[PDB]
Amino acid sequence: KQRQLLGRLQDLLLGPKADEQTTCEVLDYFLRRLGSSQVASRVLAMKGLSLVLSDVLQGYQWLLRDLPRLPLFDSVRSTTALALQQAIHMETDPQTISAYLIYLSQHTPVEEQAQHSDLALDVARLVVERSTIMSHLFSKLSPSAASDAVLSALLSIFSRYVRRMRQSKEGEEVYSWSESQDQVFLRWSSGETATMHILVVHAMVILLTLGPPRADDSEFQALLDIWFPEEKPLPTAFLVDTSEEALLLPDWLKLRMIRSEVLRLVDAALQDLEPQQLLLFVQSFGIPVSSMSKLLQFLDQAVAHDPQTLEQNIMDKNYMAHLVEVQHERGASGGQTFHSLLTASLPPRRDS
């Protein structure tokens, strides 16, 4: 019974008989289950959608080629985009996330500023809040063509978003009763201006940390130069509510971006680092050897500059001494002066 009814519906939708009311009602009767927390509900909804609709990524053509080729696609495109933006945080499979990201990149409602801002916000929530899925999408163990494609898509989305914000004129009505207090006015060193969400900034810098895509790097290089120019002051933003120094690079984000192999990012981040943050960073793990060497070099510079304050900020010098010792054993350069300071309050002990 169910199969025959589904087959009859297939003909009623794929043919010219399809209209706004029937298609919208049928889609809404299944789109609502996508955002449902029940995993089985969303799986069944997606499978039914695939059944209704019907080399690289041959098993995902139902979303790339079949679904867009719908006469009423433009009518429900905003609804589809909104539904995917709500379900992007509920759904968990990395490949499905990849397919959603590619569809959003290809089929963005670019014409409306509000829709672009909302899509950027949701993608930033994905990048920041969801880290394990982020690890899956760009797994260094098994890099794949899909990973490079979604990385390029995210770079394209963020690049076009910042390019659209560049077009904004001064004195416009963009300054209004913003629904989010997190909106921050960003001013570049070269006199450019734009208003941005700090979460989107965090997402943009995190995307850079993943390294350059193997296929295309023009977008990556362009974004990197826009955000991190060489031998020039970096862009700074001030909170519109209070005109105070916005924390554009929190400690966790800085720690994350040291891990990135890009030398420019880590060199920019290391500049003007306080002793407590420096100690917190060298306490962390997973940092590459060259970055570890640069951390030790900055530690040596801090010791040469202001050694007395560094002593007061150390909770326990034993762990730090052991850490610098094992890093030296690893082959990291620098830290000899810091190690000497740590060994000052560590007299010789019993042998064996």
Binding site: T92, T132, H322, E329
Partner: protein, 210 residues
């Protein structure tokens, strides 16, 4: 899907660190909780040989990022968690979305509550093949890999949970055999006791029951 290689388990039983350094990265990720608990904790032995071994272990595990999250899980005070678990147990006498949005102590609390609930359900019942009492062990690592590491930490720090009852409970989990394997791998001395505990349930083949 991956399982800890037998060579790695034998290495941890023999507590020799050179071959552990020679071991590959995914196996290190599988055995990561026990390695993290090894260093950056109390010396226990207070012997210089174990000090050198701990130095080698710290050198080995420095080249991976998940240990940051593991240390974050370790920093949480366990007295409050102990009291909460005991109070919940006495009182009794989406999950993955919350897991992603929870910090270390809330993650410990929720997963420990779920594990205690499943343990109590197994103990109260006659073990009549409780197929799946939870849905927080799905294929993405947010419910699989971090969850398993967290479960290993829970089996370690709040020691009130005996390894045998956790082992009995894990059988009823949908993908619990892998969790059992890695948990026994992270506690090498527990192999024969968990085997004894599991073997003492079910006389015949149960007519090939689930």
């Amino acid at each position: 899907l991956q399982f800890v290689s037998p060579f790695a388990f034998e290495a941890m039983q023999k507590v020799d660190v050179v071959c552990l350094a020679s071991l590959s990265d995914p196996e290190l990720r599988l055995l990561l909780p026990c390695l993290v608990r090894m260093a950056l904790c109390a010396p226990a032995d207070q012997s210089q040989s174990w000090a050198q071994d701990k130095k080698l272990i710290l050198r080995l595990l420095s080249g991976v990022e998940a240990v940051n999250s593991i240390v974050a899980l370790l920093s949480v005070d366990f007295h409050a968690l102990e009291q909460d678990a005991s109070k919940e147990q006495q009182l009794r006498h989406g999950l993955t979305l919350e897991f992603e949005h929870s910090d270390s102590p809330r993650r410990l609390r929720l997963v420990l509550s779920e594990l205690l609930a499943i343990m109590n359900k197994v103990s109260e019942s006659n073990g009549e093949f409780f197929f799946k009492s939870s849905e927080l062990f799905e294929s993405p690592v947010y419910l699989e890999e971090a969850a398993d590491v967290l479960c290993i930490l829970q089996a370690e720090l709040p020691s009130l949970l005996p390894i045998v009852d956790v082992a009995e409970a894990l059988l009823h989990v949908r993908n619990g055999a892998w969790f059992l394997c890695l948990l026994v791998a992270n506690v090498p001395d527990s192999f024969n006791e968990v085997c004894r505990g599991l073997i003492k349930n079910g006389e015949r083949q149960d007519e090939e029951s689930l």
